[model samples]
Target: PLIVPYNLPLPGGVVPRMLITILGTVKPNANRIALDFQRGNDVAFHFNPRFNENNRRVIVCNTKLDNNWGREERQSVFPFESGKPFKIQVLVEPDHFKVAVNDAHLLQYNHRVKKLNEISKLGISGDIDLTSASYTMI
Candidate 1:
């Protein structure tokens, strides 16, 4: 799991979107992950879906870049959000961010911002109780 301890808001601009991927292989599957999009930022968005939590895993993709959104952070997040206490696998593939939490189920988010790269910094909050975290860039 990515620990965004700082309160710095990584607001999605025009091309950079923060994607969340939840794994399914690990035990204790988390149906819902409470993410603070912009708890205190002026520009922020939150898609806290209830049904998708604890039941169906999701992949949040941020294909916000011009032609390489997922290429940059793919390695960092791929291995990081793959396995752990929450079983969440987040993938940054190409221009899309895929979040798979348990099996094939996931959630997709396409961002549109003139300055997409501005959303690079994200503050992950809510559930801090995690046993392990890993990522792999493919």
Candidate 2:
């Protein structure tokens, strides 16, 4: 099984028309997990799913610049379940990232960092067993 807190350098960085794919199974007692697109110290995109936060399940998306996080975009529709395998895809667009989970549309996060190609790393952590993570032009 692949380990948690997995980090990978994004080859060619991020660009429009690129697709990032992640396959993993949520831990049975999972409370949260995170996937981040990073550019040095800044987080270009933060995709976080919380199984229970104040008794609610939600997915929160945001960006962090200069150590400060921007306004969060929260979706109450939770597409992930504990102990279930899921496929996540992030389609990079010119102005936003289109996210899909289990082959269904999840949400769109508008680009806050502006320069997409500067996003050079992908980070994954928290309660999951990662099967694979990769990116390709599509």
Candidate 3:
């Protein structure tokens, strides 16, 4: 199994029309997990899935700059489950990132950090076993 809290550098950073793909499985007792697109110390996109928030499931998306987080974009549709494997894709667009979970279109988060090409790192952490992570520029 790949290590938890996996971190990798995007070879040439992210660009418009790129696709980021992550494959992983939630732990049986998972409460939360996060995937981040980072630009140095700043987080360009923070994708978080919560399984135990007041007994409700949700996905929260946000951006952090200067050590402060922006408004939380919460999607109430819970498409993930514990003990099950998942496939997540983040499609980079000119103005937003389109997210798909398990081959179905899920949600989109607009760009809060405009410099897409400067986003050079991808991070995954919390409560899951990573199978593989990769990106492709199209």
Candidate 4:
């Protein structure tokens, strides 16, 4: 079983058009999955997809710090499957990120914490088992 909250280093930080790919399977009883792009202790983006909460599906995107969770952005357009493999792609842009799930556009999150150059870390966790993950530099 893979460990929860798997973290990896991003040496050069994220730049425009850089792509991050996550390959994993959501647990049969999954409640959520979160992807955090961060620098030091600050999170540039918190990408989370929640399952079965009030029987409604949604992806929550936000930023964090001050121990606060900002306004949640719920697309309610989740394409993840329980107990099935999934591929997630995050494409960095000048002002936002375009995210796709299973090769389909899922949602977009604008820079609330800006300074993309400071984002040098990635954290993945919550109710999923990763098989492979990678980042491609621009």
Query: Which candidate's lDDT is highest?
Result: 2
Candidate numbers, best lDDT first, in rank order: 2, 3, 4, 1
Better of 3 and 4 by lDDT: 3
Estimate the TM-score of every prediction.
Answer: 0.40, 0.97, 0.97, 0.93
- Residue 48 accuracy (lDDT) in model 1: 38
For residue 86, what is the lDDT in candidate 1? 47
lDDT of 2 by residue, 49-83 (tens): 99999989999999999999999999998999999
The Cα local distance difference test for each model comes to: 0.37, 0.93, 0.92, 0.86
Write one digit per residue (lDDT tens) for candidate 3, span 1-138: 689899968876788889999999999999999999999899999999999999889999999999999999999998999999999999999889999999999999999998887899999998998999988877
lDDT of 4 by residue, 45-95 (tens): 899998988998888898887667788888877798789999999999888
Ranking by TM-score: 2, 3, 4, 1
For each of the candidates, the C-alpha root-mean-square deviation to the true structure, in angstroms, is 9.9, 0.7, 0.8, 1.4
Winner by lDDT between candidate 3 and candidate 2: 2
Error of 3 at 124 (Å): 0.4
Off by over 4 Å in 3: none
RMSD of 3: 0.8
Error of 3 at 51 (Å): 0.4
Q: How accurate is candidate 1 locally (lDDT)?
A: 0.37
